[PDB]
Amino acid sequence: RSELTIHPKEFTTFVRNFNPFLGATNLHTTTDFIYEPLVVFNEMHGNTPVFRLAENFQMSDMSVTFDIRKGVKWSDGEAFTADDVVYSFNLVKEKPQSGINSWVTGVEKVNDYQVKFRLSEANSNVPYEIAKVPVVPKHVWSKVKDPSTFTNENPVGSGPFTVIDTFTPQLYIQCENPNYWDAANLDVDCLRVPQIANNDQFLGKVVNGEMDWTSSFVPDIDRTYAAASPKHHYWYPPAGTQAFVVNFKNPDAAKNEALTNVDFRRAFSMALDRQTIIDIAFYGGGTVNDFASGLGYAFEAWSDEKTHDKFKAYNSYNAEGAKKLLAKAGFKDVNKDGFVDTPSGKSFELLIQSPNGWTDFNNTVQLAVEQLAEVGIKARARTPDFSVYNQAMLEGTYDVAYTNYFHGADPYTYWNSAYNSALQSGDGMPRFAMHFYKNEKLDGLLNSFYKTADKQEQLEIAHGIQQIIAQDQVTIPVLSGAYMYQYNTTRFTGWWNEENPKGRPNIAAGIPERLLHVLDLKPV
Ligand SMILES: CC(=O)N[C@@H]1[C@@H](O)[C@H](O[C@@H]2O[C@H](CO)[C@@H](O)[C@H](O)[C@H]2NC(C)=O)[C@@H](CO)O[C@H]1O
Ligand SMILES: [Ca+2]
Ligand SMILES: [Cl-]
Ligand SMILES: [Mg+2]
To answer: Hey, which of 278, 403, 484 would you mutate to test ligand 1's pocket, going by the most ligand atoms within 8 Å of its Cβ?
Structure first.
């Protein structure tokens, strides 16, 4: 039988948790692979909707109706009906997701193959959001203990791989669903998932040809990995923004004083050599992002160039100008250590964090630390475990953090996740908006992005968002990165690549297109 060796997320050890709602404790082969979505949007191809469990959807003259494919059965033989979708959306309406429920007011079963979704506000992006919610078996989950602390070790599933073949703390094997509706399109028998804690461990394995489908950072990829075998390939199409995020609500006076000063964020930004960061840390694998709004050149067409030009000096390498701005603002060194102190005369050191084992970001931070020291800003690096890293952002105890962002077909994915202040509160919230900068006009502009179908007005919305973020230098954007993807042609063929660019190729959870991707691979 064919086994596909994948690596969607680093772990020290595997805990048997296949619950789709628990995205902080589950295995990252649960969404898509076990619970197939209604629709997959091919974001690389203009969000073209690829229909799976749903046959179609129809916005009413305004709310949506989904039609659900017939003859579709769960893993245990029981049939997939509207009742299963109905029971699923119903369940998060009274037990909160991460997806966000701020868009759907209840659900009607209307037909055992048609479901009515009632809308809170009106949003043309709402099928994209509905697609994120996992549909679970009604005939199974309606039992359940506490649906919130429920490991799902033996999962009833709709997706391609539902059988747990093997399960050690360093290896688990996830095999073909017995009653899979698309099994005719499926030629991979099993997902084979090894436990890998960080990039150093990954690197030995990938260079030894032990992997099939991976998305980790690989330093000097052409020398280390590609040169080791003719079967060793990769394809890095462009992805989203990377930046230093600063905490506007730091609990230390001096640090708060520094971080909340726009002069100081702009001097911080100007000391950075973004091209050198790309060159050394990412081995050339990226593009300088000198948009103060973090827009990035892939969305250059969306850009109000007046705004970009106006603030780009603040987002270009200019240590001398960084030194002058610090002095004009009042960050004077008054204790003879060569490091500027706050206007009220306090010494400080910024602690800059990135996740343990994400060595590309670790190196970016260490590069920035030295760059900062050159213009007299004192900083130190920290590389905590992702969960610690993430937690420090959620509770606002960090100073400065290097982070990447998710990336969409337009700039809304980046701008909303990164700046909508409503995403600063909750408890299943991601790290992305946790600078705690807040602007009602910015939030209003974001909230109205998909409110009108006037492309011209949507574009004026973008320019208004761009201007607000840029003039306030809310973060320090550094670069635009790549979709890291490595593939082995030793055991399989049919891979997406530069010659076959059918969509986002990565294996990470959060890329629904990985389902469509595995449906193209054939054993060799
Ligand atoms: C936007 C986001 O949070 N994406 C996450 C990915 O960055 C992350 O993958 C890891 O990214 C690091 C930084 O570039 C790499 O150093 C690292 O190799 C890579 N790890 C893997 C297994 O791909 C993944 C997984 O941690 O989570 C994504 O959500
Ligand atoms: Ca000093
Ligand atoms: Cl800009
Ligand atoms: Mg196929």
So the answer is: 484
User: What ligand 1 atom has the least distance to the C-alpha of 481?
Assistant: 14
**Protein residues with CB under 6 Å of any ligand 1 atom:** 7, 9-10, 199, 215-217, 358-361, 404-406, 508, 510
Ligand 1 centroid from CA 216, angstroms: 7
As a whole number of angstroms, the distance between CA 24 and CA 123 comes to 28
SS3 assignment, position 232:
strand
Q: Distance between alpha carbon 63 and the CA centroid of its chain, in Å?
A: 28
Q: Which phi and psi (to 5°) does residue 415 adopt? A: -65, -40
Sequence letter at residue 276: T
Looking only at the bridges linking them, the beta strands covering 232-234 and 114-119 are unpaired
Method of structure determination: X-ray
Reading the block at residue 105, the tokens are: 């007011």
Reference 41, options 513, 521, 465, 519; nearest CA is 513
Taking the C-alpha atoms of residue 202 and residue 197, their distance in angstroms, rounded to an integer, is 8
Using an 8 Å Cβ cutoff, are 411 and 302 in contact? yes
- The CA distance from 355 to 382, in Å, is 8
| Tokens standing for residue 65 | 């109706």
Instruction: Give the per-residue SS3 of 36-89.
Output: CCCEEEEHHHCCEEEECCEEEEEECCCCEEEEECCCCECCCCCECCHHHHHHHH
Sign of CA dihedral 495, 499, 501, 506: positive
Q: Give CA–CA dist 286/277, Å, rounded.
A: 9
Measure 347 CA to ligand 2 centroid, in angstroms.
5
CA of 185 to the centre of ligand 4 (A): 4
Q: How far apart are CA 287 and CA 284, in angstroms?
A: 8
- The tally of CA atoms less than 13 A away on the side-chain side of residue 235 is 17
Which residues, 6 or more positions from 119, have their beta carbon under 8 angstroms from its beta carbon?
62, 63, 64, 103, 104, 105, 126
Helix (H, G, I), strand (E, B) or coil at 307: helix
Resolution in A: 1.9
* Structural contact between residues 22 and 157, judged by C-beta atoms closer than 8 angstroms: no
Query: Cβ distance 49 to 39 under 8 Å?
Result: yes
Coil vs helix vs strand at 316: coil
369 alpha carbon to ligand 2 midpoint, in Å?
A: 16
Cα 55 from Cα 35, distance rounded (Å): 16
Q: What's the rounded Cα separation, in Å, for the pair 72 and 69?
A: 6
Ligand nearest to the CA of 293: 3
